[PDB]
């Protein structure tokens, strides 16, 4: 069952690595497992519930380290579907992958904890919690949309910061005497930051008529300027995934893709890496030293294929209509001029 052997290895590498469908259910169950371990460790530090906490913590920690252990080992086993990790040296470079080093690290570490280290336990749980990402795509998407909207976010925070200083300073002036809440400018700044973010603790509220009047004017501006970046980034993600949807449905790069594989096999079949290659070699000795002649021209054909693929790799939604209408109408200009010239050649007779 060597074919079934490789099929099962394929399925393991499919679910464990980049998933498509219901594999998120497996990842969900290990997510809930490690998350409940986190929650129980949190319950451990409470003095009263400590007994039941540890009584379930030892057992469940053994469960989750067994699960992590088999997951890691079968991931190494399933790395065979990838060619870069095949055999001793390939699988060992897969072990040289930094993420897998962190994984085997926390495995042996936790086992060593079992072989005042409780703070280290919760630290390790936060580490293994971050581990769940495996991609860094979250920070990448966030940084992309932040760097895109950088100037507007800076505008919102800057003007809101000036509104915070001004409103808090005026309130402090108007409410120094008859209130023990605002005793310095620092406590006043604490009040400003707590209200403009719409948190509203209630420890420091204006208790005068000058202070309440000033706050009643600057609140409609503060709370509006400190809640801008949330709405901005929100609509940013919305528009970005909307245009990514549109561009996902308009790939239209299949032609250069097939051309890519076409001339790629043309190059490999013309490459001197194998001697049994004659089918494509014959296909060119029929359609008519010569080896390298067809080889060189084929490598040029594969390079123009690769670059054409790179060009058509980026068709957009608005760039489609824009560029194709510029192209369409300029071709149309060649059409109308060819029309007049050729019908004049009919007149020329």
């Amino acid at each position: 069952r060597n074919a079934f052997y490789r099929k099962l290895q394929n399925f393991l590498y499919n679910v464990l690595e980049r998933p498509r469908g219901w594999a998120f259910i497996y990842h969900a169950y290990v997510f809930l497992l490690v998350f409940s371990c986190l929650v129980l460790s949190v319950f451990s530090t409470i003095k009263e519930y400590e007994k039941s906490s540890e009584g379930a913590l030892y057992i469940l920690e053994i469960v989750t380290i067994v699960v992590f252990g088999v997951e890691y080992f079968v991931r190494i086993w399933a790395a065979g579907c990838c060619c870069r990790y095949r055999g001793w040296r390939g699988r060992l470079k897969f072990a040289r992958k930094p993420f897998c080093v962190i994984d085997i690290m926390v495995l042996i570490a936790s086992i060593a904890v079992l072989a005042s280290a409780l703070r280290s336990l919760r630290f390790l749980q936060i580490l293994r919690m971050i581990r769940m990402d495996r991609r860094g795509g979250t920070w990448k998407l966030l940084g992309s949309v932040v760097y895109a909207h950088s100037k507007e976010l800076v505008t919102a925070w800057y003007i809101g910061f000036l509104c915070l200083i001004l409103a808090s300073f005026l309130v402090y002036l108007a409410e120094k005497g008859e209130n023990d809440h605002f005793d310095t400018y620092a406590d006043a700044l604490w009040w400003g930051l707590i209200t403009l973010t719409t948190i509203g603790y209630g420890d420091k509220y204006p208790q005068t008529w000058n202070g309440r009047l000033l706050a009643a004017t600057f609140t409609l501006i503060g709370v509006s300027f400190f809640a801008l970046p949330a709405g901005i980034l929100g609509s940013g993600f919305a528009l970005k995934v909307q245009e990514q949807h549109r561009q996902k449905h308009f790939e239209k790069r299949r032609n250069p893709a097939a051309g890519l594989i076409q001339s790629a096999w043309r190059f490999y079949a013309t490459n001197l890496s194998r001697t049994d290659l004659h089918s494509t070699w014959q296909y060119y000795e029929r359609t008519v030293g010569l080896k390298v002649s067809i080889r060189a021209v084929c490598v040029m054909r594969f390079l123009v294929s690769k670059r054409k693929f790179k060009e058509s790799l980026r068709p957009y939604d608005v760039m489609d209509v824009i560029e194709q209408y510029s192209a369409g109408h300029l071709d149309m200009l060649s059409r109308i001029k060819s029309l007049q010239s050729r019908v004049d050649q009919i007149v020329g007779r």
């Binding site: 097939a258 594989i261 076409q262 001339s263 096999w265 296909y283």
Partner: peptide
């Protein structure tokens, strides 16, 4: 492969 763009024959695509 044999009907898109720079198409080839059957022995070549079977070699692929």
């Amino acid at each position: 492969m044999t009907n898109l763009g720079e198409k080839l024959t059957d022995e070549e695509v079977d070699e692929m």
